Amino acid sequence: DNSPENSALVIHMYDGLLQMGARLCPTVQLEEISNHQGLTPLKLAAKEGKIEIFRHILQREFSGPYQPLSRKFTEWCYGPVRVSLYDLSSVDSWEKNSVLEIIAFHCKSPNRHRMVVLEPLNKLLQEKWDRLVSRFFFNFACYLVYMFIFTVVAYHQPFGESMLLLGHILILLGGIYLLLGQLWYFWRRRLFIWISFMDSYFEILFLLQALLTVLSQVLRFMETEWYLPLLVLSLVLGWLNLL
Amino acid sequence: ALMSETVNHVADNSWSIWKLQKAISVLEMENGYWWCRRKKHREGRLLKVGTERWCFRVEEVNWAAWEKTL
Amino acid sequence: DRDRLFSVVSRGVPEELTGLLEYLRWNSKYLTDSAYTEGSTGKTCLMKAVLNLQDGVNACIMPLLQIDKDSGNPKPLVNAQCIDEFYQGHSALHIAIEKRSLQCVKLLVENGADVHLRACGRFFQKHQGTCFYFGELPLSLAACTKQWDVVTYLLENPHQPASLEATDSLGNTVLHALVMIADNSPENSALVIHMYDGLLQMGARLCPTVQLEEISNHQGLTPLKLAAKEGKIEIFRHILQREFSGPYQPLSRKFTEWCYGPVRVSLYDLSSVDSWEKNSVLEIIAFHCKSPNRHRMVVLEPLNKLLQEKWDRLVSRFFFNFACYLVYMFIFTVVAYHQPFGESMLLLGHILILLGGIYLLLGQLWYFWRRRLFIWISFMDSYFEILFLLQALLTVLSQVLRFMETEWYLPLLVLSLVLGWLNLLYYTRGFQHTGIYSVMIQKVILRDLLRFLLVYLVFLFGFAVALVSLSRERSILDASLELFKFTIGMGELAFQEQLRFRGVVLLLLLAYVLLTYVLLLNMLIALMSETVNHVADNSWSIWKLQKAISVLEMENGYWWCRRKKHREGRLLKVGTERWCFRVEEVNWAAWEKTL
What we know:
mainly alpha; part of a larger assembly; calcium (chain C); ANK repeat (chain C); repeat (chain C); transmembrane helix (chain C); 3 chains; elongated
């Protein structure tokens, strides 16, 4: 538990047991053994919310004969510039069910936001974000274009008839695509989504907007007089979801 | 009440939340679209020989630590 | 590659190798030279001989001690590693200096090492891998690494004495390199200050006829100006007010005396003077400074009182300009109002406004000509200079459009009038009580509000389009004024009677009103959250910087009359010959410290 004395006790005991296990049995990976839930001590520490032992395990280094039992290797290279190498068993979706996914999704503790700025994870996530900003902006531009087209079609709705039909069918395809994407997302993440909802409330607003759009578009074919209110509600919800 | 919530504790307790949101977003994006499963990136491979394991390399200029040793 | 076996051998017993190398060499001795081409991909054997790092002496009987015997190509001047190898551009002397091996440096310099050998290749690694810009000279590398003995041996070397005034490719000297590597940390600041003082004293001792600190690099900067421009403050402050007591007294900038009892009077040397001898410290701080620390360097000690005196000497011109602008605005307002003996007065007013507008436009163009594209340094503090230009341009364009008798004269004239009336707010630079809050609230507004109007306008347009699309079965898209009436107080929220889908319209209006109230609440709370109680002294500095910019602009004089440069606080006299600024202060703790 996150207390000054217990953290020191558990760190000391962990290091001593690891060293003695290396001495007595140098041919077994103690830290690679997994329990019934399919977790290692590092993953278990990440999931349970413990941060002190998690941080110590993440960046521990040994200097003497126990050097192989280390995760951070430090050297001085060229004068007063220190270069350090961190072992990567907390890698991203590759070899899935890793530390990053566990922190992001399966973590009930309110301390999950404090474990993403430790040292390896912060720079790794910064690099990943810098590598994928282009896709984010491309998706933003595509959504803006779709919203503009839908607004134009809604306004011009009473050669023109063909354009209106093309706009309506394009909106139908866009709505069903968004609905199917949200359903796929909710299929990937099971009822475990009950972990929290203060940070994933847009994923249901998008689903609601897509469902309303699809329902209005399919209701138009029956020529019901309730098409306009549902279409307008879908338009305003999609415009609000841009935030 | 909304003013009373501002206890001046979000100086670093709000930046962490933004970092977590960015992490969730990048995790969602790198998984790829449903109609096209994107190939997993090999990240910072740097296999090499550590004293054989993939590693992530970070450099920093430190003067106090350097001046500590002679 | 096995052929590189000759690169590394068992040191201490080079009998057969040396015997076969010098002379003879079967067919010809030139093969030995080729051994330096095939030794590695750019690294010679001497580099590895230094890098062995054995106990005590690194290479015991170093092969170089006999290599110079069979030398036909200058080997002590090793060709620095080329291409990209994360260690390119390093010579044997650089490697010896790095490992803090004074003995290796001595043996290399005894055999005729080439001092002043710029690191040819290191500037590749400066951008490829580890930057560590140290000065590209062995002396600079020794000084920046805190090795006093190596520097001492290199300078007063009987064989090859290093020159303290030597320069690298960029034009930097050892002092420039020390300034450049400095960063605002407690340890590095002390290290660089100590090294700077020691090097200055040793340069005075060895060469008392050269001004080391007066040497300028390619950019045309001195160590003081370089420190001011790069944003370093600790070394800048130390250089600005350093004093020496012993025989090194002339190498000082602050002279302190007690005068009459417990009142201490101090004289500061003035090489950071104003526009006189232009390209000085004040101009560099005011204009050419990308760092956000520029506002913290105007309250150090000489600069603060100098700027205070300059402002006190030029408040009259500021108020005269304010009065003239107010008179012009009043005349323009009167002419605009009275515009439909009277015809002559109206024509005189119109032509006077034309002259005023062209004068303001030409003044702004002159200002933008004096400050080139370098104005890209910042814009959070110089946004009035474009508003004035816009207002002058609009006024001139409207006045010239009047002569063609176009019917668009009135809107442009009214826009010019309102812009000129709004531009009057710039003159709140004085009146400290207003300005301290005004500068910081301006920064906050410019940073925050620019990301409100976009999203609010987007939501308003979306809701308006939805309402006009629903109500067609509010008649046009331009009828979005209802939402603005709602956000200002009006709106007439009521049933539409004839519209059958009245419930949907009511729900949309409710959603819009709650959304906009929530957004404005968010902005309010964010603006409050900005107030972290850190502007207690971080906002007064901004006001001082604005006053400094204003006085720099004013003292330059008008474009049509170049004002003569003021001789400032001359006080030439005799300092132990240099212009000085005198400041007095009553101190009791310092006086009571001595007896």
